[PDB]
Amino acid sequence: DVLMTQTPLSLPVSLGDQASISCRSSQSIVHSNGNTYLEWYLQKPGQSPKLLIYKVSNRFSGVPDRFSGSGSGTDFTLKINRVEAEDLGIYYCLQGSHVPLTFGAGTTLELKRADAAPTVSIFPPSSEQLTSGGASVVCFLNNFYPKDINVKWKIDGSERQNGVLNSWTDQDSKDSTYSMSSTLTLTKDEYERHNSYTCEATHKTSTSPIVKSFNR
Amino acid sequence: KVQLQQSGAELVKPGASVKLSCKASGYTFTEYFIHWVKQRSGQGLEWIGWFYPGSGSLNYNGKFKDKATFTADKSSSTVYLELSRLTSEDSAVYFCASHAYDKEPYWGQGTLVTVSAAKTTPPSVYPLAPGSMVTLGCLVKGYFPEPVTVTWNSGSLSSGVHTFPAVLQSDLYTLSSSVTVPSSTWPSETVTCNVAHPASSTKVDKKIVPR
Ligand SMILES: CCCCC[C@H](O)/C=C/[C@H]1[C@H](O)CC(=O)[C@@H]1CCCCCCC(=O)O
């Protein structure tokens, strides 16, 4: 299959900036009929992808003229002349010349802001949950930037990997940060046979993790 | 105007099949291609195949050959995608797209498919209290299906709130919501999370009290 390689994976911009996104195909995507079927889409969370550009350089009806596409053969580029807030989201290229049709992995356009370390908070299981025979330990890693982050759980100083579920917010509309929740769920029985619970947040703002813990 | 109307969200039992529909208007039905596209939560787009209802011609992505079946009802300008023997990997949004040969495509709004054996179940709501600002939360666990609506203090507390996307575990959803307030306001003032679940027609409150 034709591989579509999009770069960059992530592009932080300020409103008003110029933006340029690249899409390279692993082989020529000139169709046998002479045309090149290369399309660009923008997708926001919870919405369908919206067509911006088709056949390399043609703007779909209703698309603002700040969007433009160009390219030839295996080398394609989408440009935004002065980014607006509604332009933030994930951009995909799609080749329609060779079956199976294939998409690039996406380029996220996000708002640039100052780097920020996460605010980390740990919570023991509620007495209500324990009465039900369950035990979830919750860690909030809040208002950090950039979005890349790792969380590690420790029980009695030992790394725990099973029973951990994570969830991430979209970029905040007010302060442009990201947040993450991590939940470690045990049986009540197992929870009461250990003492110390720890979640460690590793983010680019520091080589040392942010460590939050509590003791039963 | 070219329009594609996709069928409503589906809750599918594991192992069962489901048939999604895409009803077209605003053009000569038999003269446009229909494509189907899959998108798993937080992932990219994946092409399933194309179908030309005007001839019955089709092509599947080999990755979907044993999973997807395209059919049409010309008499109602409707195309169908049947997905067989569903697994967790089949939980996704499915989009249909239509175009004339060498012309721009028009996309439907997508149909959500969720695979679970669960019946309608209201959430259990648990307080998250700590052991100049303080962060509190509530854990909303074991509900089905989506969505729930979480507020704090009946909506009056909206700044500094993070409600996280739910995750499906053991066929049920779990999510958490955090709120950050000045330490001067809790526990000296009341902070309560409210959780509404339309499918079960329930709404419950949980006051956050210090342990
Ligand atoms: C999600 C996909 C949307 C459609 C993408 C693109 O716009 C479609 C391109 C078509 C083009 O219009 C004609 C063509 O050959 C491309 C591939 C799909 C039709 C294939 C039918 C006949 C054949 O197999 O050559």
Coordinates of C-alpha atoms and ligand atoms in Angstrom, one line a residue:
Chain A
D1 CA 0.0 0.0 0.0
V2 CA 1.0 3.6 -0.5
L3 CA 2.4 5.1 2.7
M4 CA 1.5 8.7 3.4
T5 CA 4.1 10.3 5.7
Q6 CA 2.9 13.6 7.4
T7 CA 5.4 16.0 9.0
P8 CA 5.4 17.4 11.6
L9 CA 3.3 15.2 13.9
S10 CA 2.6 18.3 16.0
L11 CA 2.8 22.0 15.1
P12 CA 2.5 24.6 17.9
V13 CA 1.5 28.0 16.5
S14 CA 0.4 31.4 17.7
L15 CA -2.7 32.9 16.2
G16 CA -1.7 34.9 13.1
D17 CA 1.3 32.7 12.4
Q18 CA 2.1 31.1 9.0
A19 CA 1.8 27.3 9.1
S20 CA 3.1 24.7 6.7
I21 CA 2.3 21.0 6.7
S22 CA 4.0 18.4 4.6
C23 CA 2.7 15.1 3.1
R24 CA 5.0 12.7 1.3
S25 CA 3.9 9.6 -0.5
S26 CA 6.0 6.4 -0.8
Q27 CA 5.3 6.3 -4.6
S28 CA 3.8 8.6 -7.2
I29 CA 0.1 9.3 -6.7
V30 CA -0.6 10.4 -10.2
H31 CA -3.6 8.4 -11.3
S32 CA -3.6 6.5 -14.6
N33 CA -6.2 9.1 -15.9
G34 CA -3.6 11.8 -15.5
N35 CA -5.0 13.4 -12.3
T36 CA -3.5 13.5 -8.8
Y37 CA -6.0 12.7 -6.1
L38 CA -4.5 14.3 -3.0
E39 CA -6.9 15.8 -0.4
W40 CA -6.4 17.6 2.8
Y41 CA -8.9 17.4 5.7
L42 CA -9.2 19.2 9.1
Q43 CA -10.9 17.4 11.9
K44 CA -12.0 18.8 15.3
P45 CA -12.9 16.6 18.3
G46 CA -16.3 15.0 18.0
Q47 CA -16.7 16.2 14.4
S48 CA -16.5 14.6 11.0
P49 CA -13.4 15.5 8.9
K50 CA -13.9 18.5 6.8
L51 CA -12.5 18.8 3.3
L52 CA -10.2 21.7 2.7
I53 CA -8.3 20.9 -0.5
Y54 CA -8.9 18.4 -3.2
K55 CA -6.9 17.4 -6.3
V56 CA -3.7 18.9 -4.8
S57 CA -4.5 22.6 -5.0
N58 CA -8.3 23.1 -5.3
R59 CA -10.2 24.7 -2.4
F60 CA -13.5 23.1 -1.5
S61 CA -16.4 25.4 -1.6
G62 CA -16.7 27.6 1.6
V63 CA -13.1 27.0 2.7
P64 CA -11.3 30.3 3.7
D65 CA -8.7 31.5 1.2
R66 CA -6.0 31.4 3.9
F67 CA -5.8 27.7 3.1
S68 CA -3.8 26.7 0.1
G69 CA -2.5 23.3 -1.2
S70 CA 0.4 22.6 -3.6
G71 CA 2.6 19.8 -4.8
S72 CA 3.6 17.3 -7.5
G73 CA 4.3 13.6 -7.7
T74 CA 5.2 12.5 -4.1
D75 CA 5.6 15.9 -2.5
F76 CA 2.7 17.9 -1.1
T77 CA 2.2 20.9 1.2
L78 CA -0.7 22.6 2.9
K79 CA -0.2 26.2 4.0
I80 CA -2.2 28.5 6.3
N81 CA -1.8 32.2 5.8
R82 CA -2.4 33.6 9.3
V83 CA -3.8 30.9 11.6
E84 CA -7.2 31.5 13.3
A85 CA -8.5 29.7 16.4
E86 CA -11.0 27.6 14.3
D87 CA -8.0 26.2 12.4
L88 CA -6.7 24.3 15.4
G89 CA -7.3 20.5 15.2
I90 CA -5.8 17.5 13.3
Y91 CA -5.0 17.7 9.6
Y92 CA -5.0 14.6 7.4
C93 CA -3.8 14.1 3.9
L94 CA -5.5 11.4 1.8
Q95 CA -4.3 9.8 -1.5
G96 CA -7.1 8.6 -3.8
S97 CA -5.1 7.4 -6.7
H98 CA -4.2 3.9 -5.7
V99 CA -6.3 1.3 -3.9
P100 CA -6.4 0.8 -1.0
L101 CA -6.8 4.6 -0.4
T102 CA -4.6 5.7 2.4
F103 CA -4.4 8.6 4.9
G104 CA -1.4 10.2 6.6
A105 CA -1.2 9.8 10.4
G106 CA -2.3 13.4 11.0
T107 CA -0.7 16.6 12.0
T108 CA -2.0 18.3 15.1
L109 CA -2.1 22.1 15.0
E110 CA -2.2 23.4 18.6
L111 CA -1.8 26.7 20.3
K112 CA 1.6 27.6 21.6
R113 CA 2.0 28.6 25.3
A114 CA 4.7 28.6 28.0
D115 CA 5.9 25.2 29.1
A116 CA 4.2 24.2 32.4
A117 CA 4.8 21.4 34.9
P118 CA 1.8 19.4 35.9
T119 CA 0.0 19.9 39.1
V120 CA -0.2 16.4 40.6
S121 CA -2.8 15.2 43.1
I122 CA -3.3 11.7 44.5
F123 CA -6.5 10.3 46.0
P124 CA -7.1 7.2 48.1
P125 CA -10.3 5.1 47.5
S126 CA -13.4 6.6 49.1
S127 CA -14.9 4.7 52.0
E128 CA -18.0 4.4 49.9
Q129 CA -16.2 2.5 47.2
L130 CA -14.5 0.2 49.7
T131 CA -17.9 -0.7 51.2
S132 CA -18.7 -2.0 47.7
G133 CA -15.5 -4.1 47.8
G134 CA -13.7 -2.0 45.2
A135 CA -10.6 0.3 45.4
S136 CA -9.6 2.9 42.9
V137 CA -6.6 5.2 43.4
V138 CA -6.8 8.3 41.3
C139 CA -4.0 10.7 40.1
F140 CA -4.7 14.0 38.4
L141 CA -1.9 15.5 36.4
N142 CA -3.3 18.9 35.6
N143 CA -2.6 22.0 33.5
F144 CA 0.7 21.0 31.9
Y145 CA 2.3 21.9 28.6
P146 CA 3.4 20.4 26.2
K147 CA 1.0 17.4 26.0
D148 CA 3.6 14.6 26.1
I149 CA 3.7 13.1 29.6
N150 CA 4.2 9.7 31.4
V151 CA 2.8 8.4 34.6
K152 CA 4.2 5.6 36.7
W153 CA 2.4 3.8 39.6
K154 CA 4.2 2.3 42.7
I155 CA 2.8 0.1 45.4
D156 CA 5.1 -0.3 48.4
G157 CA 7.9 1.1 46.3
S158 CA 7.2 -1.4 43.5
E159 CA 6.1 -0.5 39.9
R160 CA 2.5 -1.5 39.1
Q161 CA 1.3 -1.8 35.5
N162 CA -1.9 -3.9 35.5
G163 CA -5.2 -2.2 36.3
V164 CA -4.1 1.2 35.2
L165 CA -6.4 3.3 33.0
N166 CA -5.5 6.8 31.6
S167 CA -7.5 9.6 30.0
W168 CA -6.4 12.9 28.4
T169 CA -8.2 16.2 27.9
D170 CA -8.1 18.3 24.7
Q171 CA -6.2 21.6 24.9
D172 CA -7.8 23.9 27.3
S173 CA -9.8 26.8 25.8
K174 CA -8.8 29.2 28.5
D175 CA -5.1 28.6 29.3
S176 CA -4.0 26.3 26.4
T177 CA -2.8 23.5 28.8
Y178 CA -3.4 19.8 28.8
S179 CA -4.5 17.5 31.7
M180 CA -4.4 13.8 32.3
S181 CA -6.2 11.4 34.7
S182 CA -4.7 8.0 35.8
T183 CA -6.7 5.5 37.8
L184 CA -5.3 2.4 39.4
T185 CA -8.1 -0.1 40.3
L186 CA -7.6 -3.0 42.7
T187 CA -9.8 -5.3 44.6
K188 CA -10.4 -4.0 48.2
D189 CA -8.7 -7.2 49.5
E190 CA -5.5 -6.4 47.6
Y191 CA -5.7 -2.7 48.5
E192 CA -5.6 -3.4 52.2
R193 CA -2.6 -5.7 52.0
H194 CA -0.3 -2.8 51.0
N195 CA 0.5 0.5 52.6
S196 CA 2.0 3.1 50.3
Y197 CA 0.6 4.2 47.0
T198 CA 2.6 6.4 44.6
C199 CA 2.1 8.1 41.3
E200 CA 5.1 9.7 39.5
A201 CA 4.7 12.2 36.7
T202 CA 7.5 12.6 34.2
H203 CA 7.3 15.7 32.0
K204 CA 9.9 17.6 29.9
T205 CA 9.8 20.5 32.4
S206 CA 12.1 18.4 34.7
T207 CA 14.3 15.2 34.7
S208 CA 13.0 14.4 38.1
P209 CA 9.4 13.0 38.3
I210 CA 6.8 14.8 40.4
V211 CA 6.0 12.3 43.1
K212 CA 2.7 12.2 45.1
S213 CA 2.0 9.5 47.7
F214 CA -0.2 8.5 50.6
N215 CA 0.0 5.9 53.2
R216 CA -2.9 3.8 54.4
Chain B
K1 CA -27.2 20.2 -2.2
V2 CA -25.4 16.9 -1.8
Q3 CA -26.2 15.4 1.6
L4 CA -25.5 12.1 3.4
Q5 CA -27.5 11.1 6.4
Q6 CA -26.0 8.4 8.5
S7 CA -27.9 6.1 10.9
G8 CA -27.9 6.7 14.7
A9 CA -25.4 5.4 17.2
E10 CA -25.3 1.6 17.7
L11 CA -24.8 -0.4 20.9
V12 CA -23.7 -3.9 19.7
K13 CA -23.4 -7.1 21.7
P14 CA -19.9 -8.7 21.3
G15 CA -19.9 -11.3 18.6
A16 CA -23.0 -9.9 16.9
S17 CA -23.2 -8.1 13.6
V18 CA -24.5 -4.6 12.8
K19 CA -25.7 -2.9 9.6
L20 CA -25.0 0.9 9.3
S21 CA -26.8 3.0 6.7
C22 CA -26.0 6.0 4.6
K23 CA -28.9 7.7 2.8
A24 CA -28.0 10.1 0.0
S25 CA -29.8 13.1 -1.5
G26 CA -29.1 16.0 -3.8
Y27 CA -27.6 14.0 -6.7
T28 CA -28.3 11.0 -9.0
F29 CA -27.8 8.1 -6.6
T30 CA -26.5 5.6 -9.1
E31 CA -23.8 7.9 -10.4
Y32 CA -21.6 8.5 -7.3
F33 CA -19.1 6.3 -5.4
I34 CA -19.6 5.6 -1.8
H35 CA -16.6 5.1 0.5
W36 CA -16.5 4.0 4.1
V37 CA -13.9 5.2 6.6
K38 CA -13.2 4.0 10.2
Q39 CA -11.9 6.0 13.1
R40 CA -11.1 4.5 16.5
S41 CA -11.2 6.8 19.5
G42 CA -8.2 9.2 19.5
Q43 CA -6.7 7.5 16.4
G44 CA -6.5 8.3 12.7
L45 CA -8.6 7.6 9.7
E46 CA -8.6 4.2 7.9
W47 CA -10.2 3.4 4.5
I48 CA -12.5 0.4 4.4
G49 CA -13.5 0.3 0.8
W50 CA -15.5 1.8 -2.1
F51 CA -18.8 0.8 -3.6
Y52 CA -20.6 2.0 -6.7
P53 CA -24.3 1.3 -6.2
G54 CA -25.0 2.1 -9.9
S55 CA -23.2 -1.1 -10.9
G56 CA -22.7 -3.0 -7.7
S57 CA -18.9 -2.8 -8.2
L58 CA -16.8 -2.6 -5.1
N59 CA -13.4 -3.0 -3.5
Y60 CA -12.3 -3.7 0.0
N61 CA -9.2 -2.8 1.9
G62 CA -7.7 -6.3 2.5
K63 CA -7.6 -5.4 6.2
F64 CA -11.4 -5.4 6.2
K65 CA -12.2 -8.2 3.7
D66 CA -13.5 -10.6 6.4
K67 CA -15.3 -7.8 8.4
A68 CA -17.1 -5.5 6.0
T69 CA -19.8 -6.0 3.5
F70 CA -21.3 -3.3 1.2
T71 CA -24.8 -3.4 -0.1
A72 CA -27.4 -0.9 -1.4
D73 CA -31.1 -0.3 -1.8
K74 CA -31.4 1.8 -4.9
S75 CA -35.1 2.3 -4.3
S76 CA -34.3 4.4 -1.2
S77 CA -30.9 5.9 -2.2
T78 CA -29.3 4.1 0.7
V79 CA -26.1 2.2 1.0
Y80 CA -25.2 -0.1 3.9
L81 CA -22.1 -1.2 5.7
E82 CA -22.5 -4.5 7.5
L83 CA -19.8 -5.3 10.1
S84 CA -19.6 -9.0 11.2
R85 CA -18.7 -10.6 14.5
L86 CA -17.8 -7.4 16.4
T87 CA -14.9 -7.2 18.7
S88 CA -13.5 -4.3 20.8
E89 CA -11.4 -3.3 17.8
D90 CA -14.6 -2.6 15.9
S91 CA -15.7 0.0 18.3
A92 CA -15.3 3.2 16.4
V93 CA -17.0 6.0 14.4
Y94 CA -17.8 5.0 10.8
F95 CA -18.0 7.7 8.1
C96 CA -19.5 7.4 4.7
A97 CA -18.4 9.7 1.8
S98 CA -19.8 10.2 -1.6
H99 CA -18.4 11.6 -4.9
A100 CA -18.8 11.6 -8.6
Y101 CA -15.8 10.3 -10.6
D102 CA -13.0 12.9 -10.6
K103 CA -15.0 15.2 -8.3
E104 CA -14.8 16.4 -4.7
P105 CA -16.2 14.1 -1.9
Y106 CA -18.9 14.8 0.5
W107 CA -18.8 13.3 4.0
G108 CA -21.5 12.1 6.3
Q109 CA -21.4 13.0 10.0
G110 CA -20.5 9.5 11.1
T111 CA -22.1 6.7 13.1
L112 CA -20.7 5.6 16.5
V113 CA -20.5 1.9 17.1
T114 CA -19.9 0.7 20.7
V115 CA -19.3 -3.0 21.5
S116 CA -20.5 -4.1 24.9
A117 CA -22.7 -6.7 26.5
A118 CA -23.8 -4.3 29.3
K119 CA -27.4 -3.2 29.8
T120 CA -28.3 0.3 30.8
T121 CA -26.5 1.0 34.1
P122 CA -26.4 4.2 36.2
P123 CA -23.0 5.4 37.5
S124 CA -21.7 4.9 41.0
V125 CA -20.3 8.3 42.1
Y126 CA -17.5 8.4 44.6
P127 CA -15.9 11.5 46.3
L128 CA -12.2 12.3 45.8
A129 CA -11.1 14.2 48.9
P130 CA -7.4 14.9 49.8
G131 CA -5.8 12.6 52.3
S132 CA -3.4 28.2 48.3
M133 CA -5.4 26.1 45.9
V134 CA -6.9 22.6 46.6
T135 CA -7.9 20.0 44.1
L136 CA -11.0 17.8 44.6
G137 CA -12.7 15.4 42.4
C138 CA -15.3 12.7 41.8
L139 CA -15.0 9.2 40.3
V140 CA -17.9 8.2 38.1
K141 CA -17.8 4.5 37.7
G142 CA -19.5 1.6 36.1
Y143 CA -22.1 3.2 33.8
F144 CA -23.5 2.4 30.4
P145 CA -23.9 3.8 27.8
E146 CA -22.4 7.2 27.2
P147 CA -22.9 10.1 27.9
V148 CA -23.0 11.5 31.4
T149 CA -23.1 15.2 32.3
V150 CA -20.9 16.2 35.2
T151 CA -21.2 19.6 36.9
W152 CA -19.9 21.1 40.2
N153 CA -22.2 23.0 42.5
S154 CA -25.1 22.7 40.0
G155 CA -23.0 24.4 37.4
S156 CA -22.0 27.5 39.4
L157 CA -18.5 26.1 39.7
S158 CA -17.2 25.9 36.2
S159 CA -13.7 27.4 36.3
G160 CA -10.8 25.1 37.1
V161 CA -12.9 22.0 36.2
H162 CA -11.5 19.1 34.2
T163 CA -13.9 16.3 33.2
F164 CA -11.9 13.5 31.5
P165 CA -13.1 11.3 28.6
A166 CA -14.6 8.1 29.8
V167 CA -12.8 4.7 29.3
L168 CA -14.6 1.5 28.7
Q169 CA -13.5 -1.3 31.1
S170 CA -15.2 -4.6 31.6
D171 CA -18.1 -3.4 29.4
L172 CA -18.8 -0.3 31.5
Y173 CA -17.6 3.3 31.4
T174 CA -15.6 5.1 34.1
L175 CA -14.5 8.7 34.2
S176 CA -13.2 11.2 36.7
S177 CA -13.7 15.0 37.1
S178 CA -11.4 17.3 39.0
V179 CA -12.1 20.8 40.3
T180 CA -9.6 23.2 41.8
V181 CA -10.7 25.9 44.3
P182 CA -9.0 28.3 46.7
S183 CA -8.1 26.5 50.0
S184 CA -10.0 29.3 51.7
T185 CA -13.3 28.0 50.2
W186 CA -13.0 24.3 51.0
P187 CA -13.8 22.6 53.3
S188 CA -15.3 25.8 54.8
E189 CA -17.8 26.0 51.9
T190 CA -19.7 23.2 50.2
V191 CA -18.4 21.6 47.0
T192 CA -20.7 19.0 45.4
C193 CA -20.4 17.1 42.1
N194 CA -23.6 16.4 40.2
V195 CA -23.8 13.5 37.7
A196 CA -26.6 13.1 35.3
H197 CA -27.0 10.0 33.2
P198 CA -29.7 10.4 30.5
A199 CA -30.0 6.7 29.6
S200 CA -31.0 5.8 33.1
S201 CA -32.9 9.0 33.7
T202 CA -30.9 9.6 36.9
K203 CA -29.0 12.5 38.5
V204 CA -27.1 12.1 41.7
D205 CA -25.1 14.5 44.0
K206 CA -21.9 13.8 45.9
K207 CA -20.7 16.3 48.5
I208 CA -16.9 16.3 48.9
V209 CA -16.1 16.1 52.6
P210 CA -12.6 16.0 54.2
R211 CA -11.6 12.5 55.4
Ligands
LIG1 C1 -12.8 8.7 1.8 C2 -12.5 8.6 0.3 C3 -13.1 9.8 -0.5 C4 -12.8 9.8 -2.0 C5 -11.3 10.2 -2.3 C6 -11.1 10.7 -3.7 O1 -11.8 11.9 -3.8 C7 -11.6 9.8 -4.8 C8 -10.9 9.6 -5.9 C9 -11.4 8.7 -7.0 C10 -11.5 9.6 -8.3 O2 -12.6 10.4 -8.3 C11 -11.5 8.5 -9.4 C12 -10.7 7.4 -8.9 O3 -10.3 6.5 -9.6 C13 -10.4 7.6 -7.4 C14 -10.5 6.2 -6.6 C15 -11.9 5.7 -6.3 C16 -12.8 5.2 -7.5 C17 -12.3 3.9 -8.1 C18 -13.3 3.4 -9.2 C19 -12.8 2.9 -10.5 C20 -11.4 2.3 -10.5 O4 -11.2 1.2 -9.7 O5 -10.5 2.8 -11.1

